[PDB]
Amino acid sequence: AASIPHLILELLKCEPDEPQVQAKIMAYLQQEQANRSKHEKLSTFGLMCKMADQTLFSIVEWARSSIFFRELKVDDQMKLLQNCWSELLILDHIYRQVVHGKEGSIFLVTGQQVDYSIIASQAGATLNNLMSHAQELVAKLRSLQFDQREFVCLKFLVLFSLDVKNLENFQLVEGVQEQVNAALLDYTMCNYPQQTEKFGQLLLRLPEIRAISMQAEEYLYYKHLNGDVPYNNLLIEMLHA
Amino acid sequence: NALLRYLLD
Numbered sequence: 493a494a495s496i497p498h499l500i501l502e503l504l505k506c507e508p509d510e511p512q513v514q515a516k517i518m519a520y521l522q523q524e525q526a527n528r529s530k531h532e533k534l535s536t537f538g539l540m541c542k543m544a545d546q547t548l549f550s551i552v553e554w555a556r557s558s559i560f561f562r563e564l565k566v567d568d569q570m571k572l573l574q575n576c577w578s579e580l581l582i583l584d585h586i587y588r589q590v591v592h593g594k595e596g597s598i599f600l601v602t603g604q605q606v607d608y609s610i611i612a613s614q615a616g617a618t619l620n621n622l623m624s625h626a627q628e629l630v631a632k633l634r635s636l637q638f639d640q641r642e643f644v645c646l647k648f649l650v651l652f653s654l655d656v657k658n659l660e661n662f663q664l665v666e667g668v669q670e671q672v673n674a675a676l677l678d679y680t681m682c683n684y685p686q687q688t689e690k691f692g693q694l695l696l697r698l699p700e701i702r703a704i705s706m707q708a709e710e711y712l713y714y715k716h717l718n719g720d721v722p723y724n725n726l727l728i729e730m731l732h733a
Numbered sequence: 734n735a736l737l738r739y740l741l742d
Contacts, residue, residue: 552740566741572734575742726736733734 495682497675498640503644506558508550518602519545536614537715538722544581545725547601551580555651560668568660572651577730578705579650582626586701587643589630594640598623618711622704629700636693637684646694649690 496611498599525533534542547604555573556563564572584601592599598606611623641720652668687693715721721728 549740552737556741566738569741570737573737574734726740729734729736733737 495679497678499671499675500641500645500679502559503672504641506554507644508554513550514601514603515695517550520546521602534722535720537720541712541721541725541727543600543602544704545727547584548577548581548726548730551577551584558648560648560664561651564661565662568665571656571658572653572665574730574733575653575656576650579702580647581641582701582708583647583650583707586626586629586633586704587638589626590633590638591640592635593630595631602683622707622711625700625704625707629704631698632700633697636687636690638694640678642676642694645672646698648672649676649698 496574521539524542525539528534547572552573555569561569561572588599588601594605597608598611600606608623608627612620615623645729648668649672652665652672654662654669656662656665674694674717676694680687680694709731712721718732
């Protein structure tokens with residue numbers, strides 16, 4: 493029998509409604525294109541930028557209503573989100589591939605499968621290299637039997653980082669860090685006992701997520717410099733902050 | 734980041 497720590501139950505209760513988010517972003521992009529005439533239609537890159545934008549909107553709404561995070565004053569909330577916004581987007585994408593992804597394609601938040609082949613044919617070297625290490629990370633997580641309880645734990649570990657300067661209530665953040673780490677450790681030890689170091693193996697994925705996240709930020713920033721990013725984009729505001 | 738601040742409210 494599986495055992496799930498009470499804390500992780502609380503974390504799961506704060507999870508977004510995936511079908512609702514999917515339908516919402518799907519409808520948003522379809523309406524966006526509908527409002528544009530033929531020569532105004534967004535390119536693939538433009539669409540994906542607005543898609544990532546809407547995902548980030550959803551992530552901010554998730555955090556705002558979530559346990560522990562809603563306890564902080566807005567100034568601490570901003571600082572935490574300013575630190576980890578791209579990490580959460582990458583983590584969200586990666587886990588989506590672990591669960592909903594077929595190894596030959598990319599599963600988008602809007603629900604479509606985009607073949608990796610299309611990316612290899614239409615994207616430059618930077619994006620392909622970026623996708624390649626995402627693929628490796630997804631493959632690694634699959635081999636570890638990465639599941640939803642561990643995902644929601646890592647999500648909170650990413651959000652409540654202690655590497656954030658100028659934090660007002662840093663010991664609350666430290667408290668969440670310790671509680672979630674402890675719960676994750678107990679969960680892995682109880683439910684995956686033949687993987688004696690699964691906890692450590694999961695933690696080691698965090699610097700890999702952060703490295704991908706930094707490269708992704710840099711890729712997007714330079715795409716913006718060439719004028720390829722569609723106008724106004726919470727992504728871009730997060731970058732310019 | 735006035736936009737992020739707004740969204741959190």
